[PDB]
Nucleic acid binder design. Structure first.
Ligand SMILES: [Zn+2]
Ligand SMILES: [Zn+2]
Ligand SMILES: [Zn+2]
Ligand SMILES: [Zn+2]
Lengths: 80, 81
DNA sequence: CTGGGTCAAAGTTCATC
DNA sequence: GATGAACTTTGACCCAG
């Protein structure tokens, strides 16, 4: 079931992931970012629009928005 | 399931934009859609699109991508380099 | 009331022309 | 700039009280 919306990009959501209502895309993205301790950089103004269509344009801005909406790095477990 | 590109007959590398196709036809469809490129056929819009002559008519290669089922809706926005 | 995993099919890269 | 073989990321769908 996906009755709520993603706080980061506005796509559909099953509910909270890492503390925030998010879609499978934003969940996966935050998980991988944290697991591999990735660092991104914005080529524009560090204010890129994050919606379903544009969410992959800028990883840096997608990641800042994950944090801004409440996703917590501590909620990502170690790899099994 | 097929290992032949439905557009040009070269070995396909998997399904791309809805059609079993090669990396060449995938790449060409992606670029055409992303950049809104329009081509013109020099002959009569019926050029042979095969592994060896696929680049000899962009108009006919693109029309064949569409005819074989490639979907423009499956090409996404360009990401940051 | 959300942790985990996969891998098809999206993506980009860059040597070669 | 265009191409295409090789390389990387995404996210829909599945697992589990
Ligand atoms: Zn999202
Ligand atoms: Zn940005
Ligand atoms: Zn082909
Ligand atoms: Zn032609």
């Amino acid at each position: 079931f996906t009755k709520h919306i993603c706080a980061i990009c506005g796509d559909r959501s099953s509910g909270k992931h890492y503390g925030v209502y998010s879609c499978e895309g934003c969940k996966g993205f935050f998980k991988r970012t944290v697991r591999k301790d990735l660092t991104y950089t914005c080529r524009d103004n560090k204010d890129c629009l994050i919606d379903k269509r544009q969410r992959n344009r800028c990883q840096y801005c997608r990641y800042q928005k994950c944090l801004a909406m409440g996703m917590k790095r501590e909620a990502v477990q170690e790899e099994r």
